[PDB]
Design a protein around this ligand. Structure first.
Ligand SMILES: *[C@@H]1O[C@H](CO[C@@H]2O[C@@H](C)[C@@H](O)[C@@H](O)[C@@H]2O)[C@@H](O[C@@H]2O[C@H](CO)[C@@H](O[C@H]3O[C@H](CO)[C@@H](O)[C@H](O)[C@@H]3O)[C@H](O)[C@H]2NC(C)=O)[C@H](O[C@@H]2O[C@@H](C)[C@@H](O)[C@@H](O)[C@@H]2O)[C@H]1NC(C)=O
Ligand SMILES: *[C@@H]1O[C@H](CO[C@@H]2O[C@@H](C)[C@@H](O)[C@@H](O)[C@@H]2O)[C@@H](O[C@@H]2O[C@H](CO)[C@@H](O[C@H]3O[C@H](CO)[C@@H](O)[C@H](O)[C@@H]3O)[C@H](O)[C@H]2NC(C)=O)[C@H](O[C@@H]2O[C@@H](C)[C@@H](O)[C@@H](O)[C@@H]2O)[C@H]1NC(C)=O
Ligand code: NA
Ligand code: NA
Lengths: 307, 32
């Protein structure tokens, strides 16, 4: 029951079968320069990626025959991480040169800067859309893991000790756990979603992990120095093994499955929450929050932007 | 190590000078 694994590889995006990892990975899209971040919206048949050399986030329709690459967001100086909100239908990303976290619609419209302070080397970003929380890492001068509302609210640091290069970050939606990989301290740890009850999973000897994902009882990650995809048990850290090797330059990775984007009700309902522009997920009732593009004022009714 | 944690800086390279001091630009175009 292992999944397909979707990963960026700088020059292309690939899919590999975690049950037949020895076999050749299939190319999803090619002709890329430095594809780094990757994510998907399974029910929409979309795969997204960042290309840090083309300074863009792009998408492709993976259920269509034609393999088309459409630019969604451009002018991104270093888009090191992205996440797809499959519930509110939004695109989130980090930029480690402009030091920002930003959101837009799935087509790149209505861009809004959410955070632009106290960031240095923001990197991974993961979402819990049905709870309205976003999580990210920063491996800069103050390395940390943070969480906030997907609406930009209640930003808090949840991990800031025993941490240096937090590259990989994912969520276990069945167990309600956060997992991350630190490429300088060479481990994988987990905690509750507020950072409490931190536990080691893989204690050491991970030479340079970059990205981490999860499916059922198995963790999967990419490692820059081994040029490979590894797997282990998500509870014990045992059964450590190499899924797929001799990868050109492995980058971001996901378990590619509808089951990793569980169906839920969008609290915005059928009318975009009455929001004129953005209807973002939020961690407090009524669990959505209207928002406007960068610099645009939200009126006092909390729904309408000033056009 | 010679392995940078940046996606481009000191990672991608053309000449040894694009790499951290004492590191080399390998045949695949990456510092090492
Ligand atoms: C949208 O794409 C889904 C993913 O397809 C995979 O990824 C893309 C990029 C491409 O490389 C595909 O070639 C690749 O499969 C697709 O779901 C995948 O569908 C296949 C069947 O076409 C499933 O495989 C089956 O294999 C045997 C067949 O006898 C069975 O024993 C299995 O139990 C299984 O049914 C894959 O499991 C499935 N992958 C995932 C991750 O779900 C999807 O197809 C639709 O869903 C599946 C579950 C079936 O209902 C298909 O009939 C559907 O077409 C596709 N959707 C559309 C609308 O095209
Ligand atoms: C998770 O499932 C929700 C329940 O729907 C089921 O799942 C899918 C297969 C859906 O196609 C339904 O057929 C099925 O019963 C789903 O909420 C449903 O979304 C649809 C639109 O995709 C809504 O559609 C009819 O409603 C209006 C009413 O005026 C009609 O005018 C439209 O023409 C449309 O046909 C349903 O109302 C809605 N059901 C409920 C109970 O809310 C849900 O979609 C997400 O949430 C809803 C509220 C909307 O915001 C959707 O746009 C969201 O995608 C689905 N989640 C995801 C992430 O897909
Ligand atoms: Na920076
Ligand atoms: Na992510």
């Amino acid at each position: 029951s292992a999944p397909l694994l979707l990963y960026a590889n700088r020059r292309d995006l690939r899919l590999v079968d975690a049950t037949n990892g020895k076999e050749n990975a299939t190319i999803v899209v090619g002709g890329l320069e430095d594809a780094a971040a990757v994510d998907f919206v399974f029910s929409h048949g979309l795969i997204y990626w960042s290309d840090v050399s083309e300074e863009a986030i792009k998408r492709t329709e993976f259920n269509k025959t034609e393999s088309v690459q459409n630019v969604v967001v451009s002018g991104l100086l270093s888009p090191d991480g992205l996440a797809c909100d499959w519930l509110g239908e939004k695109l989130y990303w980090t930029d480690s040169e402009t030091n920002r976290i930003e959101v837009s619609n799935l087509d790149g419209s209505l861009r809004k800067v959410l955070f632009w302070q106290e960031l240095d080397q923001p990197r991974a970003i993961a979402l819990d859309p049905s709870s309205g929380f976003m999580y990210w890492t920063d491996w800069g001068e103050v390395p940390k893991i943070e969480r906030a509302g997907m609406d930009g609210s209640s930003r808090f640091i949840i991990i800031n000790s025993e941490i240096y290069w937090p590259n990989g970050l994912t969520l276990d939606y069945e167990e309600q756990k956060l997992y991350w990989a630190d490429a300088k301290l060479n481990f994988i740890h987990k905690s509750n979603l507020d950072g409490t009850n931190r536990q080691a999973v893989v204690k050491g000897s991970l030479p340079h992990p970059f990205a981490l994902t999860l499916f059922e009882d198995i963790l999967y990650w990419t490692d820059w120095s081994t040029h490979s995809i590894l797997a282990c048990n998500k509870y014990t850290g045992e059964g450590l093994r190499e899924i797929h090797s001799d990868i050109f330059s492995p980058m971001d990775i996901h378990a590619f499955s509808q089951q990793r984007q569980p169906n839920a009700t969008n609290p915005c309902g059928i009318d975009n929450g009455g929001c004129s522009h953005l209807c973002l997920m939020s961690p407090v009732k009524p669990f959505y929050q209207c928002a406007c593009p960068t610099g645009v004022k939200l009126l006092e009714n909390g729904k309408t932007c000033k056009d | 190590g010679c392995q940078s944690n940046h996606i481009l800086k000191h990672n991608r390279c053309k000449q040894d000078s694009d790499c951290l001091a004492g590191c080399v630009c390998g045949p695949n175009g990456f510092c090492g």
